[PDB]
């Protein structure tokens, strides 16, 4: 492996209490001679999956939960074991909350969400909606004030404005449905254009970050600011006398934050599994690990029972657990990334005038939409190809679209399948696909071939096509269970390769509509 044996490597995001999760690798240091480093490098959340996938990296990541799903599912992630009494010591929604096809896939550390954080001085009652902010900077700015200043550069903050009204990301009631996308519904586009309304009045700037923002709240310059319990630390220093509270209302509806759960996961190709299990069980997961990171950077409602009856005591934590009560835990499906992306782009976009609210949340809504729906049909064509027989069940949400496109590749693929028949079975004889294993072996492989050159729906279908030949060997073999990692591999290739070029043809859509 390229992980050293015997240390322990450790990635936490920059806004999080490093040098107090270091103190705690000090305190392993000091017990068993073996070497801790904590770093935390940029852009994180995008580089553990880079250098993970070719068995490198960090012992021990960590990240909100809602990331691990998909690096789980890329099986950059070892399974872990805690016995029953140490999972007793955590609340059981926080372990739903790092469960993974039924697996745990890591550590929770602590609950997470966004509160409307506000200086006593300027504004000594906040809002209690987001409609009576406009008034209010007007006010404020004849003073040398302004009310509002949030990070505008990721959609973590904007999120609970837009799914104040009914936006929504992944469809739950109960029970997901991920087929049902919410991105693009009248509700985000309510929140999204009140937004945009506030930068069109000049009550905010569409270039304001987190740094900024944290800065002009932090040097008394905006009433407000919208952020988590990270947050608190550097407020305490700079004096301001604030508060935390409930998140404003929209439209007479709470805004309702992603939740969070910091977690810590083991790198599946670390050699030190059963180190980061007793770096993390018997060192950070402790009364007095908690609070050494605490005390740098405050976590939030910590996971770990003991500790959060003491935090709980603070009226900050049960205004984050307020706000987190309003909103929803979030998904760990593996293509939030690609959400998350997707809804970014949309915001940027949105508030710089780059594209109106409507057609940058239709293109979010694409985004979001494009693995499931993928998948849906993709899955359906290579098992309709093996078998002879087409699958009777209902497509579901978007079921048009995915109806069409289904259709749109029977009638082109037949064409390629006939025409590549020879070319076919050269690659698949050369390929020697036996089993579950070998299929699992093929993404480097289509990566490879597909990502060269201009891209264009006819490879598209070549791609599928082959992907259909190879599942009726597989069938023929009797090696039919591999048909589905087959569908999931291939499909996890074109989203992720052709994103952008996807969403500028608007998905499956553009798809029928080449091909009519
Ligand atoms: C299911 C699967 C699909 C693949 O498609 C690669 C991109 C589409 C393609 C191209 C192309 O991108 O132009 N050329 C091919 C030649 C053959 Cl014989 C088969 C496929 C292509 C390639 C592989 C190795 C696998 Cl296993
Ligand atoms: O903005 C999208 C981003 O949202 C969340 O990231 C949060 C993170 O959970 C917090 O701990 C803190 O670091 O702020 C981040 C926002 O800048 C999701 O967890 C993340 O995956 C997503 O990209
Ligand atoms: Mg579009
Ligand atoms: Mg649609
Ligand atoms: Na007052």
């Not at 017990?31 to 993970?52: C, N, R, S, W, Y």
């Not at 954080?117 to 209690?128: A, F, G």
């Not at 990502?451 to 060997?473: C, E, M, P, Y």
Request: proline fraction near 4%.
């Amino acid at each position: 492996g390229k992980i050293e044996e015997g240390k322990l490597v450790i990635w936490i995001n920059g806004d999080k209490g490093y040098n107090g999760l270091a103190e705690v690798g000090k305190k392993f240091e000091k017990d068993t001679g073996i070497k801790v480093t904590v770093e935390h490098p940029d852009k994180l959340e995008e580089k553990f999956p880079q250098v993970a996938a070719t068995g490198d990296g960090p012992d021990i990541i960590f990240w909100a939960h809602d990331r691990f799903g998909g690096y789980a599912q890329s099986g950059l992630l070892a399974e872990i074991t805690p016995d029953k009494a140490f999972q007793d010591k955590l609340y059981p929604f926080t372990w739903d909350a790092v469960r993974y096809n039924g697996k745990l896939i890591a550590y929770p550390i602590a609950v997470e969400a966004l509160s409307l954080i506000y200086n006593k001085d300027l504004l000594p009652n906040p809002p209690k909606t987001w409609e009576e902010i406009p008034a209010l900077d007007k006010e404020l700015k004849a003073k040398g004030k302004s009310a509002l200043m949030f990070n505008l550069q990721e959609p973590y903050f904007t999120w609970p404005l837009i799914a104040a009204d009914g936006g929504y990301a992944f469809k739950y009631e109960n029970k997901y449905d991920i087929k049902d996308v919410g991105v693009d519904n009248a509700g985000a586009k309510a929140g999204l254009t009140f937004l945009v309304d506030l930068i069109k009045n000049k009550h905010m700037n569409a270039d304001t970050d987190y740094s900024i923002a944290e800065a002009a709240f932090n040097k008394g310059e905006t009433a407000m600011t919208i952020n988590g319990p990270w947050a608190w630390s550097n407020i305490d220093t700079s004096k301001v006398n604030y508060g935390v509270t409930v998140l404003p209302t929209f439209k007479g509806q709470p805004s309702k934050p992603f939740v969070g759960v910091l977690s810590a996961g083991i790198n599946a190709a670390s050699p030190n599994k059963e180190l980061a299990k007793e770096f993390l069980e018997n060192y950070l997961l402790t009364d007095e690990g908690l609070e050494a990171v605490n005390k740098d950077k405050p976590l939030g409602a910590v996971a770990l029972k003991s500790y959060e009856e003491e935090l709980a005591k603070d009226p900050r934590i049960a205004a984050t657990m307020e706000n987190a009560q309003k909103g929803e835990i979030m998904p760990n499906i593996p293509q939030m990334s690609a959400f998350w992306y997707a809804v970014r782009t949309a915001v940027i976009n949105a508030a710089s005038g780059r594209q109106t609210v409507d057609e940058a949340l239709k293109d979010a809504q694409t985004g979001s939409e494009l693995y499931r729906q993928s998948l849906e049909i993709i899955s359906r064509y290579l098992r309709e190809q093996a078998t002879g027989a087409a699958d009777t069940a209902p497509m579901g949400a978007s079921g048009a679209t995915s109806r069409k496109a289904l259709e749109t590749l029977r009638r082109v693929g037949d064409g390629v399948q006939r025409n590549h028949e020879t070319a076919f079975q050269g690659m698949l004889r050369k390929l020697d696909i036996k089993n579950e294993d070998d299929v699992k072996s093929l993404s480097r492989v289509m990566i490879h071939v597909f990502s060269d050159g201009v891209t264009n729906w006819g490879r598209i279908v070549t791609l599928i096509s082959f992907g259909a030949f190879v599942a009726k060997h597989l069938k023929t073999i009797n090696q039919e269970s591999c048909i589905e990692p087959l569908a999931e591999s291939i499909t996890d290739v074109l989203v992720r390769t052709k994103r952008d070029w996807l969403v500028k043809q608007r998905g499956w859509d553009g798809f029928v509509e080449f091909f009519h």
